[PDB]
């Protein structure tokens, strides 16, 4: 039941022209800070963000004068909250979690964690959004062709 009872927000893909437009996303139930413009990156390794990006020597910190980095992450194999923490530790300005199946948007919830891993939940700051498989696939196709994917996030509705 209540399969469509999701806190939806609009995002805008501003480039490339082929996929530019407004899309629905679901803001995660954690770490909500406003509008932010950034550029999307899909890493070649560690694509589910379940291990530290430091182990791969991967950083998403943007150089001065460039757009902040929104990292595109695949759903699966670990909690959404851990993905957001790990992307945050790697310097990403936001995380977009692409659903692994084509379905209505879902709300990324916070798990009940062991005492040894409870404190990071309080320390998540970066905006986190779940996007559809269809949009994730569209962004990946654009990036693999060499296009720059820019995006405006809006969490004012949250």
């Amino acid at each position: 039941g209540s399969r469509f009872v999701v806190e939806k927000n609009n995002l805008k893909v501003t480039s490339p022209d082929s996929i530019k437009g407004i899309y629905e996303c679901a803001i995660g139930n954690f770490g909500v800070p406003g509008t932010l413009v950034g550029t999307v990156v899909y890493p070649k390794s560690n694509q589910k963000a379940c291990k530290s990006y430091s182990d791969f020597d991967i950083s998403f910190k943007s150089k001065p004068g460039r757009l902040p980095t929104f990292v595109l992450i695949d759903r699966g194999d670990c909690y959404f909250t851990l993905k957001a923490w790990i992307a945050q530790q790697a310097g990403a300005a936001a995380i977009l979690v692409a659903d692994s199946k084509a379905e209505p948007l879902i709300t990324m919830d916070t798990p009940e964690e062991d005492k040894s891993d409870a404190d990071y939940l309080q320390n998540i700051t970066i905006p986190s959004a779940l996007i559809t498989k269809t949009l994730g696939d569209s962004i990946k196709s654009a990036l693999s062709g060499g296009d720059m994917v820019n995006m405006k996030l809006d969490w004012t509705e949250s």
């Binding site: 209540s2 399969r3 469509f4 009872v5 999701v6 679901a26 139930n29 759903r75 699966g76 194999d77 670990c78 909690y79 959404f80 909250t81 209505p104 948007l105 879902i106 709300t107 990324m108 919830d109 916070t110 798990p111």
Partner: peptide, 5 residues
Amino acid sequence: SDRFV
């Protein structure tokens, strides 16, 4: 529609 993973 809430999921942890």
